């Protein structure tokens, strides 16, 4: 007989290692012999030394969300001693490459790669400063790379955090930031115009802007172009210094920052 290891303590889990702790046995021993199993029947046992004061072991290279059992070996060059069993699962491993698609004023597409361990269900929250958190349902199940966050506010930096379930476990986060897109101005209507001049107002979108851009460029014919710059508080435009009889196409677009909604368009003729 060789006395057993005892109290096998298990100090680390993560998605391909595991770390554990025994007492050390009372022969005296030249090592001990650590080794892991799936607790099913197939797959790959790893085995690793350890020498005759260690009391501890990391054994790397495992696979996420695998039922592995753990055998410690007393050792002496007659023999060995009976194994002290202890088993753990591994955590499911991080999903990566968070993809924004079809970035549109209301809805993100988003998609991901699915981990190699296997997932349950996954949890999409998303958020932003302007409509807080919000959790997607139903949970997108193991089988999917693909998710639609719809209803969002406009002009918002969203966080995207995607994180897979497999039973009691949670993987890491895997975290995305994306912008939703401004909406434009509506109701382009033209106040008045002059053969040389014309004024158009528009209803603001809803969203908190740092300007406008309105361009002013003729149709059917060539000829100078306008562009002008407004504070983010306008609602009208007047455009000065314009060609006579001429057809005149009037684009306002929506700044915020780095981020330009589409043109609220509107053609008008000057007069002649």
């Not at 999903?95 to 597409?109: E, Q, Y």
């Not at 158009?200 to 851009?213: E, S």
């Not at 014919?221 to 006579?244: C, F, H, Q, R, Y």
Request: net charge negative.
């Amino acid at each position: 007989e060789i006395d057993k290891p005892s109290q096998m303590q298990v100090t680390d889990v993560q998605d391909n290692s595991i770390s554990v702790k025994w007492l050390p046995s009372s022969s005296p021993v030249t090592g001990y012999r650590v080794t892991t199993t799936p607790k099913n029947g197939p797959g790959p046992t790893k085995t690793k030394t350890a020498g005759p004061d260690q009391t501890e072991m990391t054994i790397e290279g495992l696979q996420p969300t695998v039922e592995y059992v753990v055998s410690v070996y007393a050792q002496n060059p007659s023999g060995e001693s009976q194994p002290l069993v202890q088993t753990a699962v591994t955590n499911i491993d991080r999903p990566k490459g968070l993809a924004f698609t079809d970035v549109d004023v209301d809805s993100i597409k988003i998609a991901w790669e699915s981990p190699q361990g296997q997932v349950s269900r996954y949890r999409v929250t998303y958020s932003s400063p302007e409509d807080g958190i919000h959790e997607l349902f139903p949970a997108p199940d193991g089988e999917e790379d693909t998710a639609e966050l719809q209803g969002l506010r406009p002009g918002s930096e969203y966080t995207v955090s995607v994180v897979a379930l497999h039973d009691d476990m949670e993987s890491q986060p895997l975290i995305g930031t994306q912008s939703t897109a401004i909406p434009a101005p509506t109701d382009l209507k033209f106040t008045q115009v002059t053969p040389t001049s014309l004024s158009a107002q528009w209803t603001p979108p809803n969203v908190q802007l740092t300007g406008y851009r309105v361009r002013v460029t003729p149709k059917e014919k060539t000829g100078p172009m306008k562009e002008i710059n407004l504070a983010p508080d306008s609602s009208s435009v007047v455009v000065s210094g314009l060609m006579v009889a001429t057809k005149y196409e009037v684009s306002v677009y929506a700044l915020k920052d780095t981020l330009t909604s589409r043109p609220a368009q509107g053609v008008v003729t000057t007069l002649e």
